[PDB]
Amino acid sequence: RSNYMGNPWTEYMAKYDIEEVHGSGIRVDLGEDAEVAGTQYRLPSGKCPVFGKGIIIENSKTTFLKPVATGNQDLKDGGFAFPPTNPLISPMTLNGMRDFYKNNEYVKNLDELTLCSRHAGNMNPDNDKNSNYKYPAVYDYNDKKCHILYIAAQENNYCNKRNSMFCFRPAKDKLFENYVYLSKNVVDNWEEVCPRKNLENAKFGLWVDGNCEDIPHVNEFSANDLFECNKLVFELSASDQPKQRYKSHGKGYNWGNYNRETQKCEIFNVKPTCLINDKSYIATTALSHPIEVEHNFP
Amino acid sequence: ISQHATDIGMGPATSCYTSTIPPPKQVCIQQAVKA
């Protein structure tokens, strides 16, 4: 029957269909495989930018963008970023990248996030005959710097001793609020087809028989503010981390309806198909920025 | 453990790189990455 027909929300709600628009893990994105000199590797592949995502290394929230340990350094002295090269490839400012690609009309005018992704996808290992492997990156809005990540791993907690493998986990945090985690597949029109802003005075719902109905079942987590609700949705979202096949393809608890008055983060794993206008609510996603709101309804 | 490093996303031990965006340019890590 036609219970889902005549939905005026279809185009507007397309960006909230995370399996379709992102198509990979969020918390941990390892949605693709790449063969390099006989060995199979895992790599981030989500089509959307992940706003406010960083990696916490053994309590330290200020280390993951530091270059990876080289030469005589012990492994725990470094972070996850590409080490210095001659000439320098990473980090590079937005202006530095626009200047670097000035003769390339297909690259030079890309938005900052897509440009960072394409710059990180540029240098290919000489061992990689088929150019399969493309590094992920972090864009820092505070100083407009693109950081190529040499380490594509996002979680490890097999971990411990300065030379032993460090323990690490992904998270939204005040210290990561200006970061953007970018896979090699970030789409050039993410602004149009991916989430970013939290929706003020709105709650996600499901369109049924010409009306926007409430999500029938939600998982209630208490949250002091929108930021804490966004952190909880991220912690529960699509994950490609090995549980022991290890690909979520974007499936997970990716959405939350934040009631600012009851201070409840109403978390769910089914895609929303409409919005309800309710002044008590803010609609968030695991991909969304933990602070920014869009005051206007829709 | 070797399999675990691959399953969590650890990438290839790589020293030299070549651009996929023109012009072709070689870039090498002067000192080896701590493994």
Residue numbers in the entry:
A (entry chain A): 102 to 258, 262 to 264, 269 to 352, 389 to 442
B (entry chain B): 2036 to 2070
Which sentences from the paper describe this structure?
Two of these, Apical Membrane Antigen 1 (AMA1) and the Rhoptry Neck (RON) complex comprising RON2, RON4 and RON5, play a crucial role at the MJ.. In this invasion model, AMA1 and the RON complex then bind together linking the merozoite and erythrocyte membranes to form an essential structural component that maintains the MJ ring. The receptor-binding site on P. falciparum and T. gondii AMA1 (PfAMA1 and TgAMA1, respectively) comprises a region on Domain 1 of the ectoplasmic domain termed the hydrophobic groove and a region immediately adjacent that becomes exposed when the mobile Domain 2 (D2) loop (residues Ser347-His393) is displaced by the incoming ligand. We have determined the crystal structure of AMA1 from P. vivax (PvAMA1) in complex with a 39-residue peptide corresponding to the extracellular region of RON2 from P. vivax (PvRON2sp1) and, in addition, the structure of the cross-reaction complex formed between PvRON2sp1 and PfAMA1.
The heterocomplex PfAMA1-PvRON2sp1 was crystallized using recombinant PfAMA1, comprising domains D1 and D2 only, from strain FVO. The PfAMA1(FVO) polypeptide chain was traced from Arg102 to Pro442 with gaps Gly259-Arg261, Lys265-Ser268, Tyr353-Asp388 (the D2 loop); 33 of the 39 residues of the PvRON2sp1 peptide were traced from Ser2037 to Lys2069. As with the homocomplex, the bound peptide in the PfAMA1(FVO)-PvRON2sp1 heterocomplex adopts a boomerang shape. A disulphide-bridged β-hairpin formed by the central segment between the two cysteine residues constitutes one wing, and the flanking N- and C-terminal segments form the other wing. The buried surface at the PfAMA1(FVO)-PvRON2sp1 interface of the heterocomplex is 3115 Å2, larger than that of the P. vivax homocomplex. The structural differences between PfAMA1(FVO) of the heterocomplex and apo PfAMA1(3D7) are, as with the PvAMA1-PvRON2sp1 complex, largely confined to some of the loop segments that contact the ligand. The loop 172–176, which is disordered in the apo PfAMA1(3D7), could be completely traced in the heterocomplex, revealing a conformation closely matching that found in the PfAMA1 homocomplex. The loop 226–233 is displaced by more than 5 Å upon forming the complex and is essentially identical in conformation to this segment in the PfAMA1-PfRON2sp1 homocomplex. The loop 264–274, which is disordered in apo PfAMA1, contacts the N-terminal region of PvRON2sp1 but could only be partially traced. By contrast, Thr2055 (PvRON2sp1) in the heterocomplex is much closer to Arg2041 (PfRON2sp1) in the P. falciparum homocomplex as the Cα positions differ by only 0.6 Å, clearly illustrating that the P. vivax ligand partially adapts to the PfAMA1 binding site.
